[PDB]
Design a protein around this ligand. Sequence first.
Ligand code: BCL
Ligand code: BCL
Ligand code: BCL
Ligand SMILES: CC[C@H]1c2cc3[nH]c4c(c3C)C(=O)[C@H](C(=O)OC)c4c3nc(cc4[nH]c(cc(n2)[C@@H]1C)c(C(C)=O)c4C)[C@@H](C)[C@@H]3CCC(=O)OC/C=C(\C)CCC[C@H](C)CCC[C@H](C)CCCC(C)C
Ligand SMILES: CC[C@H]1c2cc3[nH]c4c(c3C)C(=O)[C@H](C(=O)OC)c4c3nc(cc4[nH]c(cc(n2)[C@@H]1C)c(C(C)=O)c4C)[C@@H](C)[C@@H]3CCC(=O)OC/C=C(\C)CCC[C@H](C)CCC[C@H](C)CCCC(C)C
Ligand SMILES: COC(C)(C)C/C=C/C(C)=C/C=C/C(C)=C/C=C/C(C)=C/C=C\C=C(C)\C=C\C=C(/C)CC/C=C(\C)CCC=C(C)C
Ligand SMILES: CCCCCCCCCCCC[N+](C)(C)[O-]
Ligand SMILES: CCCCCCCCCCCC[N+](C)(C)[O-]
Ligand SMILES: CCCCCCCCCCCC[N+](C)(C)[O-]
Ligand SMILES: CCCCCCCCCCCC[N+](C)(C)[O-]
Ligand SMILES: CCCCCCCCCCCC[N+](C)(C)[O-]
Ligand SMILES: CCCCCCCCCCCC[N+](C)(C)[O-]
Ligand SMILES: [Fe+3]
Lengths: 260, 281, 307
Amino acid sequence: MVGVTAFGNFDLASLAIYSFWIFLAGLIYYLQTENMREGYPLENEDGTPAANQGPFPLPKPKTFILPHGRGTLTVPGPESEDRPIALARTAVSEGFPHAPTGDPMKDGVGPASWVARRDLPELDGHGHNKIKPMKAAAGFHVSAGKNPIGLPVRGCDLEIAGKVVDIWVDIPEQMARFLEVELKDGSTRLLPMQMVKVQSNRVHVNALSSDLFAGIPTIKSPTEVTLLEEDKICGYVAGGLMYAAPKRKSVVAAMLAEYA
Amino acid sequence: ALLSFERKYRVPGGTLVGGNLFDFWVGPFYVGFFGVATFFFAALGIILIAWSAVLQGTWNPQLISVYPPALEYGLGGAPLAKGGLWQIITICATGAFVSWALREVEICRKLGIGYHIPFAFAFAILAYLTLVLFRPVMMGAWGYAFPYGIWTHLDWVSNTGYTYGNFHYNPAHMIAISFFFTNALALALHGALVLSAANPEKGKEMRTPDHEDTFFRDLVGYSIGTLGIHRLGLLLSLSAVFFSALCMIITGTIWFDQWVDWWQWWVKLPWWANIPGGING
Amino acid sequence: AEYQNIFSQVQVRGPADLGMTEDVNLANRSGVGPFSTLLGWFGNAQLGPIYLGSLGVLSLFSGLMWFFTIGIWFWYQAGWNPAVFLRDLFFFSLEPPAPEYGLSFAAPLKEGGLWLIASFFMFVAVWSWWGRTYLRAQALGMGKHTAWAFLSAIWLWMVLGFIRPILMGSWSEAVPYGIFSHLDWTNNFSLVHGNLFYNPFHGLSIAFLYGSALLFAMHGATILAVSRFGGERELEQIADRGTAAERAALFWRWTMGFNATMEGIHRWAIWMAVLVTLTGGIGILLSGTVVDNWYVWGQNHGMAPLN
Ligand code: BCL
Ligand code: BCL
Ligand code: BCL
Ligand SMILES: CC[C@H]1c2cc3[nH]c4c(c3C)C(=O)[C@H](C(=O)OC)c4c3nc(cc4[nH]c(cc(n2)[C@@H]1C)c(C(C)=O)c4C)[C@@H](C)[C@@H]3CCC(=O)OC/C=C(\C)CCC[C@H](C)CCC[C@H](C)CCCC(C)C
Ligand SMILES: CC[C@H]1c2cc3[nH]c4c(c3C)C(=O)[C@H](C(=O)OC)c4c3nc(cc4[nH]c(cc(n2)[C@@H]1C)c(C(C)=O)c4C)[C@@H](C)[C@@H]3CCC(=O)OC/C=C(\C)CCC[C@H](C)CCC[C@H](C)CCCC(C)C
Ligand SMILES: COC(C)(C)C/C=C/C(C)=C/C=C/C(C)=C/C=C/C(C)=C/C=C\C=C(C)\C=C\C=C(/C)CC/C=C(\C)CCC=C(C)C
Ligand SMILES: CCCCCCCCCCCC[N+](C)(C)[O-]
Ligand SMILES: CCCCCCCCCCCC[N+](C)(C)[O-]
Ligand SMILES: CCCCCCCCCCCC[N+](C)(C)[O-]
Ligand SMILES: CCCCCCCCCCCC[N+](C)(C)[O-]
Ligand SMILES: CCCCCCCCCCCC[N+](C)(C)[O-]
Ligand SMILES: CCCCCCCCCCCC[N+](C)(C)[O-]
Ligand SMILES: [Fe+3]
């Protein structure tokens, strides 16, 4: 016959849960403001600060020390695109799309967008270039799957745009990142590995018709690629899904349908 | 208002229905045909729930509960106050979720990104449908579905589970649970690993993915890598829900007795069924 | 069909990767294991090296001893018969001392003492493993987030096997070592405390467990969706935001009205996961020590402070 709880210790538990909700409100505030370290303050469509920034204030800045003498990054910090954006309003009020003023693939807007990232290669923990053509990566070779090197490369118009001449590999992560494709004029381009289908007789690229391969952004040194160059290449390729759709839906509709 | 980097992505195109008619935003939200459809379904659903609350005679969110038709109605319609609201609300919920996934697809197409997100969401929608549609249809009555109420739906899981003894004994449930636990473990480790690299010891330079691999190799002798971990989190969470839907779709249909007795199949294998000793001899 | 990046199309291999050195004692690292082409379809092909060291050996030895203490008792329950061992594998159970022994170490080997021994080895294995998550991060100059997250899992484990039993006044309260029997223990725990789904900390633990599948499905799918822009190179996207991190943020902003960053998503991640066992441990620590019956509690603190 011993038990000292009945009079007011189920209060504890009430205390605990009440405390938890207070803690959780605090946590969500912390997390949301942590997640405002990029892209804020919000802007009007003309790039000026928006009047309504929401109920959460910007966090105090933090600084990342970057390795290999690359400096630091402090965020939140001044935001700017640092590149021309070739788009114009299509309506007289906010919230409508912005039409490309030129060729959106060439101009790098919409799904063809790129970010003005640093024009230096990503580096591994030893300060060497993270990504290298396999011919220059000592000891690296295809270890499984069909080796794409030497295969013709086909675009979504079902025409051959070139031939694979190498694989660019991530050295520290031991993975394939790009295929290097040589074009009809003898120059090469990089294609993201995520955007190609390696088949037994060919590499197929659904994102681009063959005529758009020459427009893929080129790299300035043939044995390295900078973060800026990767953004431009990947943005352009993915942009083909929307912008080469005329040259894809025309073909894969005249390819099938013949009976009636 | 727009994120600072947002304008260059707000181009026309990517819609699946309606061309440019609904190709616009409201504040941060993209609309599209399916944004309109979601709004319509969600609004109607919420209104009908509010009506069910009135018929029930309460506005307390902890008391409001919308029930499917009693079992006597089988798979037919029911009067509104007697299960019909549940049925219409369920059609609205389904319209709203499916519209939400298809609006996500329009957003993928505008942004030139893969479709992995709404593909993943479609697993959640299929688990919901297993419980409110697929399983009740196979069992022959809407009344086997859960009710829409904050606490009442929990009474339904308890009552449903206890119908088959300790539901722990459902083997597809065991697997689903293992995927849930393993997913949370992996989410903790993934979050922690990226953060521990991005936020190293005071005054040290950011670590690299080389260090993330090194840390896991040191710790357990294997690192799945930065691509692998996101493949994994996706696979674990989708597998959890796949095995959840499976564990329920087989329950009350192909297996309807006490789940614990299912395991007798193993104990009763000829070559050891009759050996004495142990727990089952 | 477009390629979806669930499995790699082409694997590549280079020299075995011995990893970053930093402040690690390299004498305590093994050589590299084999390379698995099978694993390499989905993740890294390389196995090892692993870090051994003194704590490592301690943890492994202690862990194996926990495992063998249970397994030896299982053989005993099988009457040393291999066929009975396999038939009844899921049914054997190493159970804690009976209530009568309280918290004493006085119980006979066959009636609790062996459970205490197995538990002791488990305690050392887990805590020394925890030290290892801290020490391996320290040696590499990294933050201690893994050790802090691990501590949250450890919290529920300690509550179940150690803290709650001590507060209740007996080892009989602890969990048995067995496949089916730990499940019976779980079902019984809920029945005896008037239905755990009335425990608000259990409902929270489940919101976080489901939220943690919701969030990993969202995150894993997002990263794969933007892997065509290098999105999985998250550390570099954090240092130098790219079109991967922007398209990911805008997918969510356009869908649900707000979004994360490449760094901050990992903070939503860490906390969604750790709160599973944080709220969990609390909910079970309160069960029986301060609240006997969650249904009864809920009638007084859920309908009565709605005042
Ligand atoms: C006494 C009760 C029984 C029990 C009986 C049952 C029963 C019955 C069921 C489960 C199910 C589950 N049980 Mg059980 N089980 C028990 C003990 C446990 C234990 C434990 C530690 O003891 C665990 C971990 C689990 C875990 C599991 C999971 C495998 C599964 C639930 C997740 C799921 O289906 O998600 C799937 C996810 C969904 C259905 C969510 C879908 C929602 C989507 C489409 C959209 C909704 C959004 C909208 C309304 C948002 C509003 C807008 C706002 C702005 C946000 N059970 C005990 C033994 N269990 C369930 C299951 O498998 O179901 C399929 C199930 O039916
Ligand atoms: C999955 C297997 C079982 C299940 C069994 C359990 C059990 C067991 C528990 C819950 C609990 C929850 N369940 Mg349930 N429940 C199921 C079906 C669902 C469905 C659905 C299919 O549409 C919904 C919307 C909910 C939602 C709810 C929340 C009230 C609560 C926290 C969930 C969560 O954070 O998840 C994770 C997702 C997120 C973190 C995103 C946030 C979304 C939440 C907060 C949405 C709330 C919507 C709710 C208020 C519906 C109103 C919609 C409006 C009318 C528009 N459940 C099926 C029947 N559910 C817990 C509880 O506390 O209940 C009292 C609990 O203990
Ligand atoms: C009939 C069953 C009861 C029930 C009774 C219980 C009980 C009892 C508990 C839960 C708990 C939980 N329940 Mg319940 N549960 C019910 C029904 C549900 C349902 C449902 C109906 O859909 C669901 C989804 C859940 C879900 C949940 C989880 C949120 C939660 C466990 C979190 C966890 O990650 O634990 C898993 C994580 C751990 C156990 C931590 C592990 C720690 C480390 C240290 C492990 C070391 C391992 C090492 C030594 C060995 C490894 C070897 C390796 C190979 C190397 N319950 C019903 C009402 N539930 C737990 C809780 O927290 O409750 C509040 C709990 O104690
Ligand atoms: C498949 C793995 C996990 C998962 C994945 C997943 N969920 C997803 C997505 C993905 C990838 C999103 O893309 C989508 C999202 O936008 O996330 C923020 C979503 C989403 N998952 C959500 C909830 C959710 N997911 C859950 C779980 C899971 N989702 C799985 C575990 C759960 C659980 C576990 O209970 C819930 C509660 C939303 C936050 C969001 C979908 C939002 C949405 O469809 O909105 C459109 C519809 C409305 C705004 C309201 C509809 C109102 C109805 C017409 C009436 C309500 C009827 C309802 C049935 C009553 C329920 C009462 C309850 C008390 C039972
Ligand atoms: C906070 C939420 C979740 C969580 C988090 C979490 N768990 C964690 C971590 C974190 C962040 C750690 O960093 C730690 C870890 O190192 O993970 C990799 C861990 C961990 N969580 C683990 C298990 C676990 N966690 C649980 C789940 C959860 N953990 C929660 C869902 C569960 C559940 C759900 O019941 C399990 C069972 C381990 C994998 C690891 C803790 C490891 C440990 O403490 O080890 C001690 C014991 C041993 C060293 C050996 C045990 C005996 C073995 C049978 C022998 C194996 C050795 C053998 C010789 C090797 C065989 C290979 C050979 C062929 C070479
Ligand atoms: C093939 O045969 C051999 C023998 C070779 C190998 C096979 C062995 C087998 C079959 C092993 C079987 C293992 C199984 C089934 C284990 C299952 C374990 C489970 C399901 C555990 C579940 C919960 C565990 C908990 C909550 C335990 C917590 C323990 C603690 C918190 C430790 C507390 C410490 C105590 C009480 C000791 C006190 C000592 C001091 C003073 C610190
Ligand atoms: C558990 C989900 C909770 C997440 C909701 C909290 C944050 C949403 C509000 C973000 C506001 C966006 N804004 C205006 C700052 O851009
Ligand atoms: C059909 C389920 C009932 C829907 C009720 C509306 C959801 C509101 C969430 C409950 C809020 C409870 N609270 C905090 C006010 O006490
Ligand atoms: C390390 C992640 C690998 C997944 C293993 C997760 C544990 C679940 C074990 C059940 C496996 C059942 N299954 C899928 C083989 O049928
Ligand atoms: C998820 C945990 C996986 C266990 C991976 C164990 C790999 C250890 C490799 C070390 C062996 C190297 N070797 C052969 C030189 O000794
Ligand atoms: C990382 C933090 C995300 C916060 C998500 C919060 C979900 C709340 C779910 C409500 C649970 C209500 N209940 C009955 C357990 O008390
Ligand atoms: C427990 C979570 C319940 C859902 C709460 C809804 C949060 C949605 C975020 C609001 C949308 C952001 N914004 C800028 C439009 O305010
Ligand atoms: Fe990530």
